[PDB]
UniProtKB/TrEMBL annotation:
Parent-protein residues present: 1 to 106 of 316
Source organism of this protein record: Thioalkalivibrio sulfidiphilus (strain HL-EbGR7)
Protein's name according to its UniProt entry: Type I-U CRISPR-associated protein Cas7
Domain of life per record: Bacteria
Length: 106
RNA sequence: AUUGAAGCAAGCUGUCCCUGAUGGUCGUCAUCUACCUGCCUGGAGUCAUCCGCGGCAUUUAGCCGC
């Protein structure tokens, strides 16, 4: 089975997903420290809001693949390279899949 | 302020080349709630013919439809 030939020369991949609140018609947006909800005026005048930052989206999208109790990848992803920290007593302190800076941490 | 030029400190030296961007989770709990009279008395009234004088007439030279 193959799919990469269709993307072997394309310059970029773009994907869009449309959501709805499951019940009711409200949601809680990100509470950024300096201003709370990040509202701004759109190019076409209309009010706009940023739900969350792409850095937080990345912190989530990396986490969905790590099984924190086992300290291992999900079964389909098991065996891929990862570096893991242990404390002086050998307990699993942290791993770079969950670290902030990804190989540049204290 | 003027006939015979203040209309007069007038000619006086500052140019083109440079990439400031890689990555940071602002997130969890909170009961706003209970009692109360709006209402009340007050005159808007009164008389004034839709007919058509249009059209024909530049018209008082003279009449005629719906």
């Amino acid at each position: 089975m193959k799919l990469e030939p269709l993307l072997s020369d394309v310059p970029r991949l773009l994907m869009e997903a449309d959501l709805v609140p499951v019940q009711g018609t409200r949601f809680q947006p990100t509470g950024f420290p300096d201003l709370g909800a990040a509202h701004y005026e759109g190019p076409d005048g209309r009010p706009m809001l940023l739900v969350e930052s792409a850095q937080s989206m990345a912190n989530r999208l990396e986490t969905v693949c790590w099984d924190k109790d086992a300290d291992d990848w999900v079964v389909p992803l098991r065996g891929l390279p990862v570096v893991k920290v242990l404390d002086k007593a050998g307990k699993p302190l942290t791993n770079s899949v969950l670290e902030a800076h990804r190989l540049n941490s204290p």
